Ligand binder design. Structure first.
Ligand SMILES: NC(=[NH2+])NCCC[C@H](N)C(=O)O
Length: 603
């Protein structure tokens, strides 16, 4: 309705549309349709095989898309030969600049001017929706992430889960899904009765509201030191552990104030978190939890366990031998001796709840790889319980952040304190580089840039890999860091030099043929790839791809600054260049937001 329309104007036939491709919002799909249809004619290979066979190129010097011929699986043919042959009689006509042969590979080069005519206009038009696409129709996904425990440490694990999840949610949306961002709070268990008993003994009602997360934490720490100083010959009823297990007796019974106090720990906590998450551009839809598991599903679950015959007691505890389904798993405990539920069981139940409540098409749990088996288990259990949707569950894991524990006394503890230390460290960091700051709101910018630093550093490599939290390296404006993207966005933004509504309009009509410099052709190539980048990332749930793409973008824009000057040029030239810079800035903006960043715009 925009790129295909442009095609009409330019009077160019649209190649056959492969099923599920989206040439309207992804010029690389358009290009894929053209190549498959035309390469299909030369060879005896149906385009349904070529389309998926087209791959990205390691470097832009090897083309835009290529095909390892052997992957086409053509009987008795010499790939080296075919490549040379096809690259010869292959029709570039209006779409490609050239087609080349490199061993058993054939490489395709898009027409830079063709791209410009469609890509720049499309970016400037759809703006913030540029990378968007509807590769999905009426599909709902639940993405559970961060999920800290109340009164307990919000460690690096939670942080990491928080960052990946926030991004996965944004990604899933720009790709057409309906997203339910859920935060499965750790807010139940004997530990809360203890907490309740502790708030009584050392708690302050005013401190609870001023700072629920910190106060409750400090309260928990204190009530524990009592549990230790006791334990011996102390009436195991007037003891702390006693009143804890007793005060917890509110799961069987109701109100008894036993809940009024707890429901406030939870709600006041959630109210604080909401502001904190806002700094990471995350707004949860549902603040669920282990406590929020329906009594119905919990019982229905324990029930179905036997109805299917998976249970088998041992030492007085109920277990499920997943061995026969996957030796890698094991005899998972679902109910211990004292006839009480476990962490694994609350997850089995919570799933059951979430399904009947949302009837999701897919559910994603962003949990550390430390809990791999945990997930793998209640996934295999939900399966044997019959529930079909179990196949629609997925565990997106990740390695651990190391050396982050800045708290000189222990592990990082409170999320907001993290943001704060980052901001502080980035503030004095900004102070040391007189060349970058002249801003009016240092503090504010510091927070945004600081958070940018944390996010980028965390998403640079694969999720599964352990990475070192390096204050020095991450806050710097040097290498491929968060601050680097921010300052780049800022420079690009300034280059647009106030783009009136009517101005961005003349950009759309600029004479792109004036963008003949190679440095420009490379950026244009690059800009057309954003939609494909997102498409690939949801396929892997790896933000690296995006982060790597955004740095290639800023670096190319950097190369362009040296040659594609705007000031002092004729109007026609300046307009064609600014159109490019603007489209470039738009993509950069989009990509950063997707990752969870807040592009610094107002200095
Ligand atoms: N459904 C889940 N198990 N979500 C993740 C829970 C993580 C847990 N709160 C922890 O701190 O380890």
């Amino acid at each position: 309705a925009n790129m295909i329309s442009q095609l009409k104007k330019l009077s160019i036939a649209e190649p056959a549309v492969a099923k599920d491709s989206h040439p309207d919002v992804n010029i690389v799909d358009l290009m894929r349709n053209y190549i498959s249809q035309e390469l299909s004619k030369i060879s005896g290979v149906d385009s349904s095989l070529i389309f998926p066979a087209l791959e990205w190129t390691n470097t832009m010097e090897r083309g835009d898309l290529l095909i390892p011929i052997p992957r086409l699986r053509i009987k008795g043919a010499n790939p080296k030969d075919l490549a040379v042959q096809w690259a010869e009689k292959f029709p570039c006509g209006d779409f490609l600049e050239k087609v080349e042969a490199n061993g058993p590979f054939i490489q395709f080069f898009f027409n830079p001017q063709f791209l410009a005519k469609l890509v720049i206009p499309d970016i400037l038009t759809r703006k913030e929706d540029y990378g968007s696409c509807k590769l999905v129709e009426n599909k709902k996904v639940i993405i559970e992430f961060s999920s800290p425990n109340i009164a307990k440490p919000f460690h690096a694990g939670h942080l990491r889960s928080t960052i990946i999840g926030g991004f996965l949610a944004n990604l899933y949306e720009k790709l057409g899904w309906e997203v339910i961002r859920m935060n499965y709070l750790g807010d139940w268990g004997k530990q809360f009765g203890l907490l309740a008993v502790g708030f009584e003994r050392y708690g302050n009602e005013e401190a609870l509201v001023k700072d629920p997360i910190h106060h409750l934490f400090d309260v928990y720490v204190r009530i524990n030191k009592d549990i230790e100083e006791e334990g011996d010959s102390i009436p195991l009823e007037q003891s702390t552990n006693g009143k804890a297990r007793e005060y917890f007796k509110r799961m069987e019974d109701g109100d008894e104030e036993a809940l009024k106090i707890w429901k406030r720990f939870r709600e006041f906590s959630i109210e604080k978190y909401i502001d904190t998450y806002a700094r990471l551009n995350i707004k949860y839809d549902v603040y669920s939890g282990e406590s929020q598991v329906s009594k119905e599903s919990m019982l229905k679950a324990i029930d179905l366990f036997k109805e299917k015959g998976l249970t088998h007691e041992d030492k007085g505890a109920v277990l499920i031998d997943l061995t026969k389904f996957n030796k890698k798993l094991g005899k998972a405990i679902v109910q211990k001796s004292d006839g009480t539920t476990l962490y694994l069981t609350r997850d089995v139940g919570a799933a059951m709840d979430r399904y009947e409540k949302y009837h999701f098409d897919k559910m994603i749990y962003v949990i550390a790889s430390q809990q791999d088996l945990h997930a793998a288990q209640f996934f295999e259990i939900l399966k044997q319980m019959g529930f079909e949707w179990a196949k629609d569950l997925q565990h997106v894991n990740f390695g651990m952040v190391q050396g982050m524990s800045t708290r000189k006394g222990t592990v990082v503890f409170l999320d907001n304190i993290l943001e704060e230390t980052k901001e502080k460290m980035h503030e004095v960091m900004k102070k040391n580089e007189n060349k970058y700051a002249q801003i009016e709101h240092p503090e504010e910018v510091a927070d945004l840039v600081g958070i940018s630093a944390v996010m980028i550093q965390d998403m640079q490599g694969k999720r599964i890999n352990n990475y070192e939290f390096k204050w020095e390296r991450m806050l710097s404006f040097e290498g491929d860091t968060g601050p680097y993207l921010q300052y780049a966005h800022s420079r690009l933004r300034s280059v647009e030099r106030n783009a009136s509504g009517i101005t961005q309009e003349k950009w759309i009509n600029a004479d792109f043929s004036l963008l003949k410099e190679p440095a420009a052709k490379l950026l244009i190539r690059l800009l057309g790839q954003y939609p494909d980048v997102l498409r690939n990332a949801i396929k892997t749930h790896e933000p690296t791809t995006v982060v790597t793409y955004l740095f290639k973008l800023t670096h190319q824009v950097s190369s362009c600054y040296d040659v594609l000057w705007v000031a002092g040029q004729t109007e026609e030239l300046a307009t064609a260049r600014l159109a490019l810079y603007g489209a470039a800035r738009q993509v950069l903006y989009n990509g950063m937001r997707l990752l969870g960043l807040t592009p610094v715009e107002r200095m």
